Amino acid sequence: QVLEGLDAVRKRPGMYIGSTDGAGLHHLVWEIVDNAVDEALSGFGDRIDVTINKDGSLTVQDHGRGMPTGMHAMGIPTVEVIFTILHAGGLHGVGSSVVNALSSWLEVEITRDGAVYKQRFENGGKPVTTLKKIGTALKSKTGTKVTFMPDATIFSTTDFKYNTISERLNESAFLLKNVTLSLTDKRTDEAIEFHYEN
Numbered sequence: 001q002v003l004e005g006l007d008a009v010r011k012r013p014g015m016y017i018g019s020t021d022g023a024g025l026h027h028l029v030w031e032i033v034d035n036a037v038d039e040a041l042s043g044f045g046d047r048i049d050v051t052i053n054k055d056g057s058l059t060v061q062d063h064g065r066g067m068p069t070g071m072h073a074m075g076i077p078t079v080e081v082i083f084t085i086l087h088a089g090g091l092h093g094v095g096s097s098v099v100n101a102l103s104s105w106l107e108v109e110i111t112r113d114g115a116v117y118k119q120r121f122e123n124g125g126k127p128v129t130t131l132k133k134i135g136t137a138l139k140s141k142t143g144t145k146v147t148f149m150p151d152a153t154i155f156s157t158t159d160f161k162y163n164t165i166s167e168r169l170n171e172s173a174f175l176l177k178n179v180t181l182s183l184t185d186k187r188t189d190e191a192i193e194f195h196y197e198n
């Protein structure tokens with residue numbers, strides 16, 4: 001297993017997301033959604049909320065365990081390793097890092113153990129903060145939130161399509177069972193929820 005930096009993805013995006021058109025743009029959504037879905041599949045979290053923000057960024061929030069908030073080597077947060085090393089609930093191999101590489105900015109927010117942490121990356125996944133404790137929450141509160149702005153210098157289109165996302169989340173709700181998937185478009189105010197009882 002040869003590990004790579006985020007430059008590798010930016011130089012050959014087609015290798016990781018297939019294309020740099022709308023199909024590729026939406027593959028970024030699929031990667032982050034799929035990480036939330038994997039976490040719910042393992043029994044952690046019963047809702048996954050997706051928001052297309054007015055500024056064109058996209059948020060996915062889960063109520064799973066929260067990505068680990070500790071250190072890897074050399075005082076580097078485990079979260080930073082997930083989002084910045086390409087191994088070409090989990091996590092990676094290779095999703096979070098590919099999305100970060102192809103975003104002009106990305107924020108991850110983790111809630112667990114009574115604490116709220118945040119890390120921000122810019123310009124193709126360069127950390128501009130460490131994993132910072134930003135606040136507190138009840139001990140019962142857990143989850144991972146990822147918001148990213150796709151890189152307009154990579155993609156031919158940076159316009160997320162509500163109907164495309166809605167269909168994928170409907171499908172994911174049907175496969176998962178007993179988990180609510182929601183979509184809210186802040187550009188147009190549209191919203192929908194999916195939940196299949198089993």
Ligand SMILES: CCNC(=O)Nc1nc2cc(-c3cncnc3)c(OC[C@@H]3CCOC3)nc2s1
Binds near residue numbers: 039066067089
């Ligand atoms: C909004 C997108 N949603 C998400 O990415 N959800 C995720 N939820 C988890 C939970 C764990 C998690 C927590 N506690 C205990 N075990 C795993 C995890 O672990 C990553 C591990 C360290 C490196 O790879 C294995 N990743 C994720 S991504």
